Structures are given as structure tokens and as C-alpha cells.
Write a protein that binds this ligand. Structure first.
Ligand SMILES: CNC(=O)[C@H]1[C@H](C(=O)N[C@@H](CCC(N)=O)C(=O)N[C@@H](CC(N)=O)C(N)=O)[C@H]1c1ccc(OP(=O)(O)O)cc1
Length: 99
């Protein structure tokens, strides 16, 4: 296997916005480690001329989620959202960032 092209570690929210706005496709994303909420993860996605941010929420079972459906890993959250939208208003499917 190859390492996941979506994990950026502890990068600032503004830095994530700066690089995603330059990407050419809707759905281009990254997972980053939140500075505002230490220990947690955040999802940043490009759509149109904006960059949307989602908190990767945790429960007492250690599951990962954005809305209702629970996942065992960050990898499973990401993979599910490549075929199912992260939004109910717009069709936003996650796709790998271009290097
Ligand atoms: C300025 N306010 C926001 O960004 C708010 C983002 C939001 O509600 N986003 C929409 C989705 C994107 C949009 N519509 O622009 C939402 O309804 N999020 C839900 C679902 C979710 N899992 O984020 C929520 N706020 O619980 C919150 C946020 C806040 C913090 C953060 O981590 P860091 O602080 O960016 O590391 C990520 C997202």
C-alpha cells in the first residue's frame, strides 16, 4: 500500500483553506488534527469557491462520525464519503487532493 494522501497532521485551519481553494475539483479534501480542539480531527473540503469545515465527532465508544452514521475508523469515514455526500443540500463527494 501507499500512505493516504489526505492526512496532513497538525496544520492550521487557514493553511488548509489556502491550499484547498487552489485545488481544481469539488470534493478535494484533507483530514487535519484540530488546534482549536486538541486531540480531535477535522475535515476540510473544497466546494465551488468555498472551503467547508466539518468536525470529526467522537462518542464514548471511540466511534468517528460527522452526522448520524458511526464509523470504526477515520479511514472508513473517508471511504464511505467518496460515494455518499457529506452534505444534504449539495452533492459533495470526497476525492483525493492533487499533488
Ligand atoms: C466557523 N464555524 C465552523 O467552522 C463550524 C463548522 C460547521 O458547522 N460546518 C457545517 C458543515 C459545513 C458547512 N455547512 O459549511 C456543519 O453543519 N457541521 C456540523 C456537522 C459536523 N460534523 O461538523 C456540526 N457543526 O456539527 C464547525 C467547525 C468548527 C470547528 C472545526 O474544527 P477547526 O476549529 O476548524 O479545527 C470544524 C468545523
Amino acid at each position: 500500500m501507499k500512505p493516504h494522501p489526505w492526512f496532513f497532521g497538525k496544520i492550521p485551519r487557514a493553511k488548509a483553506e489556502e491550499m484547498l481553494s487552489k485545488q481544481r475539483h469539488d470534493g478535494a479534501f484533507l483530514i487535519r488534527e484540530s488546534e482549536s480542539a486538541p486531540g480531535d480531527f477535522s475535515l476540510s473540503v473544497k466546494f465551488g469557491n468555498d472551503v467547508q469545515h466539518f468536525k470529526v465527532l467522537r462518542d464514548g465508544a471511540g466511534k468517528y462520525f460527522l452526522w448520524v452514521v458511526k464509523f470504526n475508523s477515520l479511514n472508513e469515514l473517508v471511504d464511505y464519503h467518496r460515494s455518499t455526500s457529506v452534505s444534504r443540500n449539495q452533492q459533495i463527494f470526497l476525492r483525493d487532493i492533487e499533488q
